[PDB]
């Protein structure tokens, strides 16, 4: 009854859409064949079919294959309906001038009609779930052309991204910060709320809580997908304080422009930790809360909590979750904006959170906060001198004008980055007036 | 005092080894490698002979024509010398330690009349050695390639003179002559034209005309001697699948060719048309003759043995095997004549009287690493490294469930509860996931994990109520299936790969690499004895009787011993293992014993106490 | 005479999915490092 | 789905091809008869990169192999892997190589250039999508040069919207096999510098100190020599054939590599590098996979990369790892190394992850990097064109065949051209 | 985690880290293949300070073997425990050591010493938080005595806060087995003083006098001097690789024994040393260990302790003890031998104990002495420098091969102000 379609751009999009299925299925008792054995619990990412097969209401697009491939070939071949996922024919190579112009228009529309037929058989939706990077060519320009025609054909609805974000250090690729200052450019005023998830800090976090030496990409798209799987829970499950994605919607964004918030949990202990430990209420939104379970590589103290809300999820007690945040108010290491003294929307729900074949701890309590703060200007203005820096002397700028590119908008998107971070220094300042 | 148990039977065939499968010119016994020993097989009345002393697995292995000389190789290890030991067949003695390769042997040939043995080495080596047999030391040798080429990889002998030796291998034809007078071999190249081919498989016919090469190429190369030049080449459309891996030059006019997708083929070489052809499952290695040639002996690399027949080709598999290591071995609860080994691609099913294969799944290329019957029968439970727990059919082979990612670095052991609801599993991470089945579902109970390493054996008290977790980190944990923590932690300077409880539930035995047996009690986890039990090698594998008076145990030292335990003086030990010991099982009849190795053979004992 | 099953997927000893092995020898961890401040890790 | 059009011109590019397919075919499982017998549904999966589907299972790959003399043809189809390639795509020509640019391009190749490209559009029409073309040859010598640049002409002028990787093996000054190597790298190198969009330089001098030294060969062949070649040439190309996380091809290899349309020059490097004696003491790991890949001795064209800053860098990875290892040791390499690298480009090291890593091994590091240091190899051609053109000698021939004093004025002053930037870019 | 690189340079230093790596690899459990076959599981936890890895756990040491003659390095190889060390760690060269400080250090030494610091590098950035480099050489000779000093100011240079621990052999006043060691010595022991932070002095007349005396053998062997040097290679690093009570590593040996930063130069003891007769009238416990230990006879360094004052001293124990042994004997010796330990210093003995006693025994102790003592040995050496240089002989190889009169006029000046703080700190 309150459903919302994912989207999954991009090989990130894949593999972390691979990660949030495989939680979906056990989260809802779902066995990857579409059956389930022996309530309107599933109806919300999965479609009920005659014989009992749920298929999900995702779209996995990308622009060249064998990611796809691995879910057409492994072992959740059945439980999605085969052409759902969309291939293409031709990697877009890390430009966005061919993720946006040259090649996204052989398969826009087929993409397009599949999010209307999806969207058809649905009766209350409550919007888009988007997955991809502010990296490669297909989960930029793609996802950039999904934000232009889903602006036009559903533009009431919520669009909701959860991007994977260049790491200020480590990085990827040389033409990252070429990629995602255009892409934020085109999907600034498209884009409703932007959940902002970094590797480097889902690095730090499984090297030092979760006790992993050696993971590879599937942890941080697991533990992606566990954040995913709560901020939609209260929708699915029932609790005390219910939470939809509108309302997350209204209270996280402040300003037309300003929707970019961090997510972050709550225990991400690996089980030798665990039993020694209280897991209580309180210590768990002081681990949220601490500057090193941030999903991104900034420093809240260089900068200003702005608005967030709690998502919890479990046997929680709401004495205790008011008392948890009645010593978070206090603290002045945590400090918030002068001009919104309620900046907290609480949510909670009756449901533990699951526990997958994968290495995160049988818990019974979770948050995720998702917090919108002023100190991720830093993160864009590292990002942005390093567009500066390349594009001093026109660094790669020839193999995006000849797919189709023009010189200025390369300027147009970095005035309008200039102009973001002005609104970001602009809403920093304490009243005076 | 020190008795032998009987040596019933064994199943196990080595048959990476090039010209491995021979057959004696007596027309009865088969001479076939496995593991640190030669088996001798009477076909007619079915007893197994070893030939014992190597120490390492065995490389190669040749027979004098005459027929009373064996010659055997090792792949010890690198830089230290390689062995050749030089049997003699009617009496089985080892009568020299023949020594000079810095690698391993990978060729060995005896002269037509036997006076010379040549030792074509490995490829550290690369060097043809003469060894006389009278003297029995070498002669002369020399660098069997060329500098500008690759190794040779095979040599064969004359067939009515002792002076033109042929090596071949990566395009390293070469025709060399001794020059006993002066002692020296003289190297004679050869080419073949334009044709730079790879040979695997090398033969000649009863007279000295030509020899035959087989090619990586899937073609068949005659050469002439004599002239030291090619003369005709192979099926140059339908070139052999993979290639021709086993050759051998019948006496009257035709050749038998063998690929490496089992192709046997009966050819006759102006063109080399298959005039009978014969799909053989595993690729051909060895191919010998039965006396004149009316049957034959074919060793498959899948370490299947077939004997077929030239004036029809109608197949008889006479002894299948474990292609590599064995893992486990297990009985179902009643019937004791029938009995499952896992191995590193397949499990397959024993029939025990006859010791043949009856059903065998074939999981492609993925280790299983333990197996388990449930109680009522219906399903085998297997640990693969897949990080998978699948259950296959008992009769026909089906997949009823795969328990997908449930442990991170594989899954190495796996038991059933009694009542048919609990799977306990165990990996290399430590955990000690159990998982509970239903009619179509399986869960995840609780993940109880305290290890910091592997997970060696998982033994289930007889209530269901309590299990034993053998770990390589030296902790044996008396777990607890009611309420799921844990009860007592024994601790110890070892790494457990065994552990099994008393029959009736006291004291839980644990052995390891410390090469020492121990009871432990299960109150304060505390130790009642510590008792020998190996001179040199881990022990790994332990079963009690379920009497609860004695036990069977076998490691690393090739050699199976059973204790008895209100004693522990080696009460009967038996001998005969080519190769480190994985597990030993006592049937539930209390009647027979069954060893599985890492060489891959699967070896029967008696039980010999009626208790 | 003899039963098979051959699996339907051939898969490969490359594209499992697991946790990947320390090349240190992970019971007595050899080549070894701490945690930042400290920590006998996970195996 | 993508696949590549490979092409072998002359000796060096045929025997260095035919390498290649024995390497492409023992990773893939095809025999040298050309039936698949593999151990794994992934070599299957996208076996439609290098080979065409024959009847009953009889892969044929899809390789122009062209000579203007039938002397290595014969050497090819006798070779180990010989029966693979169709008996019909074999385009030779009976007449002589010269190792004469104008013999090899405005003469015989002109003439066989008409049969070549026939048959490269043949491969190129038998398409679903193709990505573009490899070419292995030579500058040093004819055929290779003269025929393979204008094949590298006609085929950039005939599809212009495909990525092209030429691997050219190119003169060392310790030694030289051909007196006009010189000439024949520079009228080469004229119409390599605005054609081509990768370009990888193979330098034999190079080639044999990493058989020297990091194999601890005694007796490296040509066979063991062009191995390596064919490793690093199977390294571009892994992603495109196999899964994996973060998969990189051709095309994204060039887009993130190359900042300007004429710096496409780079020189590669293979990492699982371990001698027969001393793979036993090797505890193969992803930070001394690194050490390898980044040491100045595994290069595989002969210019130090002390003596010249790295533009871009990219590292395929091949096997089953992690990728924090990764990411950490690129920036440890990285921030160790900062005067090694480029300012004015940040994070410029590309990383590929691929989960299928060679056969007898478990983890490989392919090295491709555009760095400033080509001068040591084109000021070095270029100081040898200058000593022997002032002088008009061995270029009698050169005029005699149908070229005048103007191109190879043009072809001197083009790599003075090509020079400039890369240095300008070496001081910023 | 502390990790120690160890150099071996010269034939007597190739040797005695050839006789260590044995009596390590002993104490540790691996056999000469490399992998492990113990006991006990304490021995592998920390095996991070001597032993780098290999596939399968196949342990091999972090040694750089150096010398400029290839001969020694086959006896290594040829040796017990020779298959156990890195073929490219095997750094030589085709030259000759010549026994000549100037050939070994102006010279094909400092054409050698780039390609050694390359293998010192690959050894040092492969670990987490190094600490020490141990050289095993002879001052009296060649390589060790150039090539050594060479290569301590170069890793000095490099790792400014890590520490040199540089057992050497100094020459002896009965014997020379070569006419060049003043001059070797001086030239040695002038980059000494100013790079090493812990230089142990091992005097072969010394090892002479302990396997005479105490250990009462017939026949000796330079095997058996290499051993008791092991013994004490052993004893200074025991607290890094096995747990026990109060541990004090190699940094907190040297703050505690070096009281200034001239005075650095120890002289070393073992001693459960008793003869195969003898161990039946021994008493075995900890009076004898402290005796054996104190005396002027297991002194490896021939200087005898009676003749000037202990500024510092550490005994490390090893072996299941309680303190009540150490403590009260240590302050019982501190406190009657008072006129011995200089009086401006209190309680001048560092303590330090480990649980496991090395293989074969139950209780050892292994001394190390910053004595006045060490001015006989360097004041020796500046008579038999100044009885040569007056002449001006054995030493125009010294001005052939680069060097300079004032060259040598600075060492012996340095090595006589080396010879004041030694007298002046023993008379107050
Ligand atoms: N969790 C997760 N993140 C990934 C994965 N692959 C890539 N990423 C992130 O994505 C960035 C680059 O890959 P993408 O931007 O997704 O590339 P793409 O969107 O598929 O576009 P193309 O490169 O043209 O194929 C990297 O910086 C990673 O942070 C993945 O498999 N899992
Ligand atoms: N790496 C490698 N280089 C080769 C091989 N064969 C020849 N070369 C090189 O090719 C160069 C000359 O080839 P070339 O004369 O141009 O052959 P052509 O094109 O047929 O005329 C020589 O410098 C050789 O070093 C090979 O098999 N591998
Ligand atoms: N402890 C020990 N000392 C040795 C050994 N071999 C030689 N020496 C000493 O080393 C001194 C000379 O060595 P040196 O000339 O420096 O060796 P070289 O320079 O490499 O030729 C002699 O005085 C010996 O006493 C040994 O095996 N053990």
Redesign the interface.
Known sequence: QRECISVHVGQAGVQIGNACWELYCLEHGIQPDGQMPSDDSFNTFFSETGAGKHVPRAVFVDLEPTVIDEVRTGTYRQLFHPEQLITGKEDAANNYARGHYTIGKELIDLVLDRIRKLADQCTGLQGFLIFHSFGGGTGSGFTSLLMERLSVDYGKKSKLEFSIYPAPQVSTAVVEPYNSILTTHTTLEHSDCAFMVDNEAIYDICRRNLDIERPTYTNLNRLISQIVSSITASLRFDGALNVDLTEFQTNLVPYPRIHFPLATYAPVISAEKAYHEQLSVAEITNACFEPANQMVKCDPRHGKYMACCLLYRGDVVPKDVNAAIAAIKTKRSIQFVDWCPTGFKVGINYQPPTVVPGDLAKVQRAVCMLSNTTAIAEAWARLDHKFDLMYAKRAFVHWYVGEGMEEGEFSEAREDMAALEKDYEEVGMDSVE | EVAKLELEAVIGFNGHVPTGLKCHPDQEHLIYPLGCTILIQAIKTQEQNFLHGHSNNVSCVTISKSGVYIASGQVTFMGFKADIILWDYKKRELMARLSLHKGKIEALAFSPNDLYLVSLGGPDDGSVVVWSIAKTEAICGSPAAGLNVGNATSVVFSQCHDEMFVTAGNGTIRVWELDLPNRKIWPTECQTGQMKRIVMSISMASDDSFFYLGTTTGDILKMNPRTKLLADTGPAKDKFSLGVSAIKCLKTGGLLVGSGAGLLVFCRSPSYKPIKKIQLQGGITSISLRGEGHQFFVGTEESHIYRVNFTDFKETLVTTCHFEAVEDVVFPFGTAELFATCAKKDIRVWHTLSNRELLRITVPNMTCHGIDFMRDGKSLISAWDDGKIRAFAPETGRLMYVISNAHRIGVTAVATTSDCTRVISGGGEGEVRVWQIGHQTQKLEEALKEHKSSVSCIRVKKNNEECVTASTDGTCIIWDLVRLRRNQMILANTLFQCVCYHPEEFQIITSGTDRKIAYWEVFDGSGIRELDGSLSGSINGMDITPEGVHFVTGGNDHLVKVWDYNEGEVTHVGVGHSGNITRVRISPGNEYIVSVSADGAILRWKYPFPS | ???????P????????????????????N???????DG????? | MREIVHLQAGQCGNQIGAKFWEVISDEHGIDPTGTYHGDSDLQLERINVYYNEATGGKYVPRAVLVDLEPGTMDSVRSGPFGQIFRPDNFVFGQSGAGNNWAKGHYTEGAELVDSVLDVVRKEAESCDCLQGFQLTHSLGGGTGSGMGTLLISKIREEYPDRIMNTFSVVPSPKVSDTVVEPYNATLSVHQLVENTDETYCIDNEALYDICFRTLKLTTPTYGDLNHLVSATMSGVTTCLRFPGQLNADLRKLAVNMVPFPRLHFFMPGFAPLTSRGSQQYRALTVPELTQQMFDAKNMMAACDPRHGRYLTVAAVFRGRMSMKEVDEQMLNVQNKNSSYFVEWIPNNVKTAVCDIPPRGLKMSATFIGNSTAIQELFKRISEQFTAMFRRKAFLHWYTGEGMDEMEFTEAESNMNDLGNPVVTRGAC
């Open positions: 005479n003899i039963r098979h099953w051959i699996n997927k051939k898969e490969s000893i490359h594209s499992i999915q697991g946790s990947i092995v320390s090349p240190h020898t992970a019971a007595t050899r080549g070894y490092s701490r945690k930042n920590g006998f890790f996970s195996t």
